[PDB]
Design a protein around this nucleic acid. Sequence first.
RNA 1: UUCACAUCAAGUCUCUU
Length: 806
Amino acid sequence: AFKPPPRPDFGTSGRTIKLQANFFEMDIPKIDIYHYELDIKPEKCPRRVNREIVEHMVQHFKTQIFGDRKPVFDGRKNLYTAMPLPIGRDKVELEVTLPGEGKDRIFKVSIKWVSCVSLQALHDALSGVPFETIQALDVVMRHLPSMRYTPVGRSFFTASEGCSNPLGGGREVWFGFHQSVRPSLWKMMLNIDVSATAFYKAQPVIEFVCEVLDFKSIEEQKPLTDSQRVKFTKEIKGLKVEITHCKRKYRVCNVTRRPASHQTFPLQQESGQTVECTVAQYFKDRHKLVLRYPHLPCLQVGQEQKHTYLPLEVCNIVAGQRCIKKLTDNQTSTMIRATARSAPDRQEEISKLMRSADFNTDPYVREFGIMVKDEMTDVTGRVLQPPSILYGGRNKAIATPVQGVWDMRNKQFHTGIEIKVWAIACFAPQRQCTEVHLKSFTEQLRKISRDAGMPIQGQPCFCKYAQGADSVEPMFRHLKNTYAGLQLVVVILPGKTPVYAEVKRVGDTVLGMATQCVQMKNVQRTTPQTLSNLCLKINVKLGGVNNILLPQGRPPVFQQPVIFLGADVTHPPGKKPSIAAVVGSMDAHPNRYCATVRVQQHRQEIIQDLAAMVRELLIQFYKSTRFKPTRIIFYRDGVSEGQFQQVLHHELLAIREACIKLEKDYQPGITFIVVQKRHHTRLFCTDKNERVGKSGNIPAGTTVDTKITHPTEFDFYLCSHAGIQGTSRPSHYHVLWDDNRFSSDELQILTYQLCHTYVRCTRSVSIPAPAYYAHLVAFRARYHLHQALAKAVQVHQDTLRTMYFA
RNA sequence: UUCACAUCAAGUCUCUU
Ligand SMILES: [Mg+2]
């Protein structure tokens, strides 16, 4: 339970396709490079500051220490050099003083040698693995960009010269790129990809207040209401501000309730005695400054103490601050508008980026003798054959997926459910949604249901109008009590409303009855496709089977009983908890899934109570099939490489712990797979004849497990979905454990077929259904809103065995 | 709420409030 398995083989399935990956080969010298450690005093300075200190330190001590050498820097505590520094071995203490805001002051730095980073040893590892050596290369690579650009994670960003793209609310668009050094067989790869994220516009807080509160002019003043203030506080708390009146960015902690004219602080007079002085008066006495907007609040900085309240008019927003807060429906949209391009389009943008970057002329990488190709790596992919999807009806219509898509026309559900009793709850005003609208909708709806293999028998037994989330349960109690055998409640909503949160709360936790929701606009105007996808959601919500994988066309793993698990944990931005969700198959298709859900520590990827969740799912698997899984396939979503050994140590045992809590000698083979969509590896078609759709992506089924993958471990890429817009993300899979002795072909084909079991659409999705369902559960649980919390997330006993999250 | 695609770094200081 400690070390991931080696790659078993490469696999031969599918027909070859020629691809290029945004990976650029690196030529690394066989030399040894030298590692030094740095003790900077004070040691709590951010990387940007340390970088400047070190940059000045290298220039200043030119003659004695560095000379004509060009050392790179961690930003924290590591410096690397191409040839040995004249440290010799023993520690040296250096002093730097830099320009200050007005104090002009001090930094104590010292160098000590640590080791000799062997690059030749790295070459050997790439031929059948030194993280430390890899970390050194990253530093050599991003030493320069880190100086000129704004480092964000493993990416860089700069302000447009330029476009200057707004988003409103003080937010603006910054275009950037990602750079990372990746290992692969034989070669070291430089992963490059174009990026774009939100940043706060460098403007005075006064102007910032306007964009946040939608002010034309400042005046349009009187003190901000309790409403206007809490929004501004929530938008500025945690941001850096700088003083205009007399370079020192300070970090905002809170915004005062009282205006500057009335907000006070204890000021100590020259006679020892302290007194309460207003911020407005202090700026008059001390700074000769009569406040222009005394009716506006004060930004509060430093700690809870000392106090340090600053008026809004003397503060600006520090440049280079990324926006962490999620953005409005539109801001996201216009951001995507900027990004999206298409796969051919973005491949040029990377090449354009590689052209301007010009690594082969970088002073620091020339120093280290490193060379990088200007052409994308050429890889062969295999496009796997999609599984035949089996439908029911009388004709047993088999659908064959074409380019990640199939249809339901002239086809019917595997086991369609006979809806006989159902109600309708319209929360949209009758003025917008009329009885004619509902009736039309319904008649249109039923007609689809008919040809879908899931017939709705007649008119709804109940139909009413309502308003407010408070009117949900009194109607819902009424429905369950007065209608015996009630199957479905069709709630109709006017756009966005907290009613949905209550509808899903009561329907999944309190009363426990399926509730399908639909916006007002989709009732006023109905389309056969939209209605059809609704029938996909309500059939499975009533314990139905839309379609199953073709039995004969399945991997040899289904020969014995096997459960497929899907796990994902979603996180909040406030002091809210993280939500861990784990699902599991409940049949041999696989089609039906049960959902477990927990709450845990704030920002914690490790599923804490995993052993309990897996235990529950295993019980349900036996309650549905009389079978104890001989194998456990686990698709874990959202785990990075640096956390692999962490989640493997706790979550693999947790699954094993769950197996032996049931029975002492119950040890099914466990396959632990981590799925990733959060990466920067893109695949492009070499031939223009292989491009699909004018987004021009790789076809669904494109599998890459060579050239750019892990040199020793079992990992592969699989773009299981059909790209509709922009550039597709080839989902990465990394086998952390596998008792089942899977082959490359079998596991990749299995993973690919599992992407065809997603019931919400007649498409092949990016991640397997278990992983996707797990996301839906942890997202539905977020609409479900300590121990109260655990209770809030608990699903009603009868909806406990249904795909309510569908 | 039809659906899919698309969508990880310390500003703690300088008589400073
Ligand atoms: Mg996640």
